[PDB]
Design a protein around this nucleic acid. Structure first.
Ligand code: DUP
Ligand code: CL
Ligand code: CL
Ligand code: CL
Ligand code: CL
Ligand code: MG
Ligand code: MG
Ligand code: NA
Ligand code: NA
Length: 326
DNA sequence: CCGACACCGCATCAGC
DNA sequence: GCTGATGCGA
DNA sequence: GTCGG
């Protein structure tokens, strides 16, 4: 973090545009800049120097000069002191409360953790659980704990059906020393792009994980995506571990590589790679990579037998997971 | 200039 | 009930 | 907010 000060500033700006301005493109613009700057191997000495990087334009360049000179940004100095913006940014930290619900609550006089707690009847299910674990979800997960969680999930999944294959993706697969949550990609031979010869595939696993008291709550649950909460079991007299967010995605067995590519991320890396694909005339999603006919319509799925294959199509040299943390 | 900006699952809603 | 639009995941 | 054509 040679340019931590600058990347943080950009991220704060990004969050403001997203949560308060509800301006998604400005949000992604700031995030892109923060990203490219974060991997820049030098201690930025000026905005001009930064403007050389792709994604950093005139505005961010001037902002970087202000920052380098004063150590702060007036624009943010202001935003920080605006109560409505401050309340809004805060409420969006609760899982399930977005920019819209956040602004709505602020309109109704609900702007503090305290307020949220005394108005649970005004929250939907997800938001209710997000509030419950507000503190816990703010904590990072040491890789060591991810390893223990991985063991349980794979072993429990195995027990349900030896034919299940559970892979931990997200930041964990990228080699991070800490993770915001645990993301699990799941496959089973009975569920392919061709057919679903067995129902309740995801349910059965969620079921088992709940039985062994690993999954404590559910934020949302469908046929192929589970979003919930889990906790590692603690020892006698040992204090309890924090509750953790867990995402489970059931993907067609024959679309594993596109699935693992997607779920490994990062989200910004996928955004960059998917944009490059488009420039190259392809479209990539968690299921497949399809060509783009002049008419704009996507074509039939191209054959894929490795993450690398996807990279080859868009003429990108393969990049290891550990190098996709953009 | 100015249009494009990655992609999609599940919860919840309004209109029918 | 359905379907389409929106919010949120993120 | 930034970019390519
Ligand atoms: O906007 C998104 C969000 C997620 N994803 C993919 C990539 C990401 O790495 C993966 C898992 O989502 P998380 O939100 O769990 N992020 P990640 O695991 O990378 O980091 P963290 O440690 O915060 O969980 O899903 C996208 O493609 N787009
Ligand atoms: Cl925008
Ligand atoms: Cl600042
Ligand atoms: Cl695939
Ligand atoms: Cl597809
Ligand atoms: Mg994650
Ligand atoms: Mg996740
Ligand atoms: Na630039
Ligand atoms: Na939130």
């Amino acid at each position: 973090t040679l340019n931590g000060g600058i990347t943080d500033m950009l991220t704060e700006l990004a969050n403001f545009e997203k949560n308060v301005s509800q301006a998604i493109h400005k949000y992604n613009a700031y995030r892109k800049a923060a990203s490219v700057i974060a991997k820049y191997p030098h201690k930025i000495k000026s905005g001009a120097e930064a403007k050389k990087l792709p994604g950093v334009g005139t505005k961010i360049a001037e902002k970087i000069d202000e920052f380098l000179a004063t150590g702060k940004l007036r624009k943010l100095e202001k935003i920080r002191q605006d109560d409505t913006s401050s309340s809004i940014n805060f409420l969006t930290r609760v899982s399930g409360i977005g920019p819209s619900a956040a602004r709505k609550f602020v309109d109704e006089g609900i702007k503090t953790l305290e307020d949220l707690r005394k108005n649970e009847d005004k929250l939907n299910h997800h938001q209710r659980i997000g509030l419950k674990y507000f503190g816990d979800f703010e904590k990072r997960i040491p890789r060591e704990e991810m390893l223990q969680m991985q063991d349980i999930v794979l072993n429990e999944v195995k027990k349900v059906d030896s034919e299940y294959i559970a892979t931990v993706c997200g930041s964990f697969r990228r080699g991070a020393e800490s993770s915001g949550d645990m993301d699990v990609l799941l496959t089973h031979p009975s569920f392919t792009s061709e057919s679903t010869k067995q129902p309740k595939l995801l349910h059965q696993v969620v079921e088992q994980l709940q039985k062994v008291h690993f999954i404590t709550d559910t934020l949302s649950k469908g046929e192929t995506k589970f979003m919930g909460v889990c906790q590692l079991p603690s020892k006698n007299d040992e204090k309890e571990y924090p509750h953790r967010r867990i995402d489970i995605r059931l993907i067609p067995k024959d679309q594993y590589y596109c699935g693992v590519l997607y779920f490994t991320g990062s989200d910004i890396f996928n955004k960059n790679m998917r944009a490059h694909a488009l420039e190259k005339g392809f479209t990539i999603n968690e299921y497949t990579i399809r060509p783009l006919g002049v008419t704009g319509v996507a074509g039939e799925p191209l054959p894929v037998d490795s993450e690398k294959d996807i990279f080859d199509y868009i003429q990108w040299k393969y990049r290891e997971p550990k190098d996709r943390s953009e």
